[PDB]
Amino acid sequence: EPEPWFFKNLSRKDAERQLLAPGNTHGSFLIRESESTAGSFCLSVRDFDQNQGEVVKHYKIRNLDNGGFYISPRITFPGLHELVRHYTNASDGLCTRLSRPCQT
Numbered sequence: 001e002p003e004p005w006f007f008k009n010l011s012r013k014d015a016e017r018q019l020l021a022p023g024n025t026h027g028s029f030l031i032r033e034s035e036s037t038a039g040s041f042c043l044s045v046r047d048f049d050q051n052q053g054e055v056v057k058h059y060k061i062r063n064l065d066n067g068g069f070y071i072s073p074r075i076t077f078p079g080l081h082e083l084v085r086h087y088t089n090a091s092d093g094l095c096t097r098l099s100r101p102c103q104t
């Protein structure tokens with residue numbers, strides 16, 4: 001299964017609720033298609049926050065001109081796969097590392 005993280009047709013709300021569901025943890029994520037707008041993707045990741053503990057945050061995956069992707073204009077990956085790779089290896093400015101893909 002090439003992309004267990006690509007929960008493409010999930011709504012913001014369905015993404016959060018899903019991540020904060022059993023079988024998931026810190027760095028547990030998914031890349032759903034953008035809700036508020038369209039055409040771009042979004043990376044939803046569960047994370048630890050001292051106050052209310054487990055939460056979910058969303059990172060906008062802006063589309064590169066040539067078709068690539070990138071959350072930060074510093075590193076601009078060729079595909080959603082290398083994006084998930086680079087951020088799984090290290091947060092690199094993210095609130096947390098992309099440990100493992102969302103489960104259900």
Ligand SMILES: CC(=O)N[C@@H](Cc1ccc(P(=O)(O)O)c(P(=O)(O)O)c1)C(=O)N[C@H]1CCCCc2cc(OCC3CCCCC3)c(C(N)=O)cc21
Pocket residue numbers: 012034035036037042057058059060061071072092093094095
């Ligand atoms: C309201 C919201 O969830 N905002 C998100 C970004 C986001 C997500 C989803 C959606 P959508 O509804 O379409 O699904 C939208 P929108 O409505 O506006 O279109 C926006 C966000 O602001 N998250 C923080 C989360 C962590 C706190 C700080 C932060 C930093 C960010 O970028 C900075 C650099 C840091 C170094 C690594 C690369 C990113 C981003 C970000 N989108 O890049 C988001 C957030």
